[PDB]
Structure of Copper chaperone PCu(A)C:
Amino acid sequence: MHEYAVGKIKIEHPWLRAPLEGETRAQLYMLVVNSADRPDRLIGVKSADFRSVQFHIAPHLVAREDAIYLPPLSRVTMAPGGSHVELVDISKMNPVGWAAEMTLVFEKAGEVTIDAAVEAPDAMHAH
Ligand SMILES: [Cu+2]
Ligand SMILES: [Zn+2]
């Protein structure tokens, strides 16, 4: 239910599937609304909790480019079965039910700090 905004970009309920026990990878999901008349891209995700990210097409295939394409005047859902950001080399993760602080970097809009809800490894979310 929580949302964020930067430039003409709006991010709705970012959330992630917590890694399995002993694993260092997670999946970041969100709904992104681009109100600009120009395309934009999610080109980066940064945090102290992990050291890098990858952009995946379902299941876990490295995508077209290392970014999430955001067409003008469009709503893009990153969700299980579609596309997501893979959080790699997680060092520190809050338990399920809490939030993980990270910074999203948009190509045009710039940076925004968010708190993604940490959810169970098999969780779903309808926006
Ligand atoms: Cu929310
Ligand atoms: Zn993946």
Notes: The two ends are 8 Å apart (CA to CA). The chain has no helices and eleven strands. The first strand starts at residue 3 and ends at 6.
